[PDB]
Symmetry: D2
Subunit: 295 residues, 4 copies
């Protein structure tokens, strides 16, 4: 037998950082969960019990805190690139670092119509994530994403003209509820190293904001022919607005809301144009994916 | 042996309702999870296998949908009271109904600075809940609550002057992070029946909004001496603003964020006034409760 | 305003303890999650910011570890009683302690048909729990429970003869699937203090084992007329077998498995006596409760 | 823009099937959660709103139930292969099917030392899974796995001789607790189609059982030098025992249990050889992966 692939590290490292502006008194907080996995010339720890090649996962944890102390943690694309680069430069035998960061929302509170200097609220479990792969001699690959963005529209979604055969019971519809949890990922062109990532720093937050805006606007405004057609429109627009993105991937559950026929009870009308009360279905759900790239 | 207490019903009934304004085209959605448990002269179903006394839980589920079809579902205090009353009036041998409702947020989307007519976002897992107990000959008891409101302040929290003995290691502090998930419940004076609940309908949404506002403002502005002292201030204010509330209960976890000493690494300073990077602790957590009533 | 009730403490304190037999080499592990909440003359911490009355929740955490170090942690009824008593004896102004313990399963592994001396498996998320309320001058109240015991029987469950009215669509059945997650609680007669709890130590594990055995046997053997009738039979037997129990409470979800009519597809027969493939329903579910005591 | 990749289908389809032996009266239940995603010539549904190419996800759901009705559901490797093949044979424009199955445990109950004919218990949340990729003209690729197998050993784990530098605080140890949740996957050699999968049917359950046995035995018996070294030993043995497996992958969290120094309290000794009470850590955790193949 032989080791074909190996990676190891620390997962679920929770980190909070505060920035205090001495002049204004304003404080800003950041909270993330970080995973770092390393690869390199480490096969002997598996095959020969040679621990001499292991950077202890506890040390990886220490390194995350130290790096957060000495560097900005925002945008997460930059922080992940700094953290990943550290490992491949510090350790001769480590040749790749894989860094995943989940950013948790802490939104500044408005009290009496003014922004509070040091109080925050978690408005939704929506996350902003990055995956950064730093590979020695191959640069830095960054995938940025938003996830956990849950939306619903109560009309202006249709689904008709699909294949019908002996397995089909679904009725065509010209008016249905559409609800989904959005997972959208944009993959950046490969960067040659940290200097190049630093040069593009302003694009990271701007592209995240654009991806979010395009997602919400397209969802709200499209008279949707299917989840497929609407998601493609979203991806198309993101690619048009940021030339440094190579691909956009969406993964969307179709969370069903079923009509409830109540006509058995005193002829009560609750279907089609009369539908007011629906039963949300926890499972099963549709799952629709697509990756859109350039011509 | 004897049946000392019994209740049965349907839990986890998900319900969505849409209201369509024909004039404006504006649609408004409501989504809830409902539990209804009944009590009454039902002992023989347990002791003698006499099902004749059982209103099937499946029928309870049907009744929830029918009631939502024929009545407003907002405010939830009113809907729960209508639903509970139905059971004690319809069935001679049922003498109490216990209705729990969890309301899920669907907030209208703003697209280009205007409110969208039919598109919604789930902004946070914060819930608005009601517990309604309808007891034949004893009226309607309503407890209203908000839960899952997660907040953090990065300074202006202290904790010193606590008891110190041979079990104590905790250092006094004049500056710490305070973060909690707020669960707040206000208990209404007993109502004589549905007519009285209807007469107070405008107070339900207003009191919820007040409870939320007071919670957020007090949290942000109090230079907190302890979770205990800050929560008492919140409850005091709510009671002062709504005379129909008899008691206010808060239950607050103290979600700890620990300093990380990094001085072992190149004398790095990250504690006390130099603290920037903290480790959020998933467990254990403090849990602090209080019920405040009138003199 | 006045403080009507208050309690505070530490939740989610995870504890592991190992016992090592020096002679045999056999090791036994215990793992629990503990919550301790205190009550007493502590109102001034809420109303006057007087922390002098607060035993810090961090100290409560330390006390749990120290107590586990110096005392047996099994049976949990005894450990909870020792822990609760500690607080009311040590602190003059604390008059009640409320201790909740969840015991996690670590079952010794069998390797090649022999019990391994130091290796364990988590066989199921079933828990054994205790709630211990130690109230100064009123003794020790103990509720013991098992929870998370998930079972299913594929036949020998019926449900017919229930009330039918204009809200009813459910068909009577003489053969259905019955599946539930068992939550069963037995409440001990009040104990005068720790000496009395110690005197009954052997009864705690034996009664837990009996409660489990009776639950499983009755479920498997009863030709069930309803969840109500079957659960009553369980409670009756437990009460008959342990005279020191005052009441037994069961809380049982009815987790539905629905027939799937496939006759639309090539006349395929999958209902009634021909039913083979079913759709488990995640929600809604029935919820059936009963508390059984002595004549 | 262009569609670079697309797949769509139904997730979270819960399925239960019962088999009734008419002779013995013995019933056997199977319960699974199934996901099916399709690929093929479906780009126009995304780009042109052409639904004519879409097999509705609702139809995919129907197909899962129909297929379960007409075929054995065990071993899951065979069922997944039947289900996947169905889609590529039935629909000209569908060229790949991806089927994921999670099998839930329903273990027959022993009542009074005999196996009960129709009553079952969920003993642990351990799962048996399959991923089946059926690609037109490229055969059937099957990855089988077990997951959620949670184990702990209280001694006979060491970790010393790792790299020490200015980022290292971890002390070497010759005696620690080792606890993990096992995720193990074995990848079968490519099969040419359903006939070949059918020919190997007996190997599927046998290899699952072997993988489980080897995992448990090696964990219990290895005097572990690291998670890395122990996991490699497991994978090596599985490969030696089944020649039709090409690779074995393990992914193992290292769930830490920390010593608690209690010496501050009356010189209490609870570290090193005196360690009895430990604090389980919910996060962070080590994460160690390896893929082992043949020379
Ligand atoms: O078994 C281990 N492997 C590792 O890589 C490691 N790092 N810290 N502790 C550890 N334990
Ligand atoms: O056992 C049952 N008890 C009930 O109360 C009920 N209601 N619907 N189905 C049911 N099954
Ligand atoms: O606000 C607090 N209240 C308490 O009771 C406590 N105990 N430890 N830290 C604490 N903080
Ligand atoms: O938007 C949809 N896309 C689909 O592929 C589908 N299948 N069923 N309903 C559906 N809705
Ligand atoms: Cl769908
Ligand atoms: Cl606390
Ligand atoms: Cl039910
Ligand atoms: Cl580790
Ligand atoms: Na390197
Ligand atoms: Na009545
Ligand atoms: Na006392
Ligand atoms: Na095909
Ligand atoms: Xe951070
Ligand atoms: Xe969408
Ligand atoms: Xe609703
Ligand atoms: Xe607070
Ligand atoms: Xe323990
Ligand atoms: Xe039951
Ligand atoms: Xe199944
Ligand atoms: Xe391991």
């Amino acid at each position: 037998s032989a080791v074909k692939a190996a990676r190891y590290g620390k997962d679920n490292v929770r980190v909070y950082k505060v920035h205090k502006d001495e002049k204004t008194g304003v404080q800003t907080v950041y909270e993330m969960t970080v995973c770092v996995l390393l690869e390199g010339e480490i096969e002997t720890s598996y095959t020969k019990a040679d621990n001499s090649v292991i950077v202890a996962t506890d040390s990886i944890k220490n390194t995350i805190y130290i790096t957060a102390k000495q560097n900005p943690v925002t945008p997460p694309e930059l922080f992940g690139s700094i953290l990943g680069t550290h490992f491949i430069e510090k350790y001769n035998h480590i040749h790749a670092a894989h860094v995943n960061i989940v950013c948790h929302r802490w939104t500044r509170m408005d009290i009496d119509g003014k922004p509070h200097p040091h109080s925050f609220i978690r408005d939704s479990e929506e996350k902003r994530n990055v995956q950064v792969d730093v590979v020695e001699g191959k640069g830095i690959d960054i995938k940025s994403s938003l996830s956990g963005l849950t939306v619903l529209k109560s009309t202006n979604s249709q689904f008709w003209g699909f294949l019908r055969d002996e397995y089909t019971t679904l009725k065509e519809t010209w008016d249905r509820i559409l609800s989904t949890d959005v997972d959208a990922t944009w993959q950046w062109k490969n960067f040659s190293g940290l200097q190049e990532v630093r040069s593009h720093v302003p694009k990271f937050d701007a592209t995240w904001a654009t991806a979010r805006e395009v997602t919400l606007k397209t969802f709200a405004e499209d008279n949707s022919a299917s989840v497929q057609a609407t998601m493609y429109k979203m991806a198309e627009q993101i690619l048009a607005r940021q030339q440094l993105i190579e691909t956009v991937e969406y993964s969307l559950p179709n969370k069903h809301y079923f009509e409830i026929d109540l006509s058995w009870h005193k002829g009560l009308q609750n279907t089609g144009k009369n539908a007011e009360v629906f039963a949300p279905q926890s499972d099963p759900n549709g799952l629709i994916k697509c990756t859109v790239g350039r011509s």
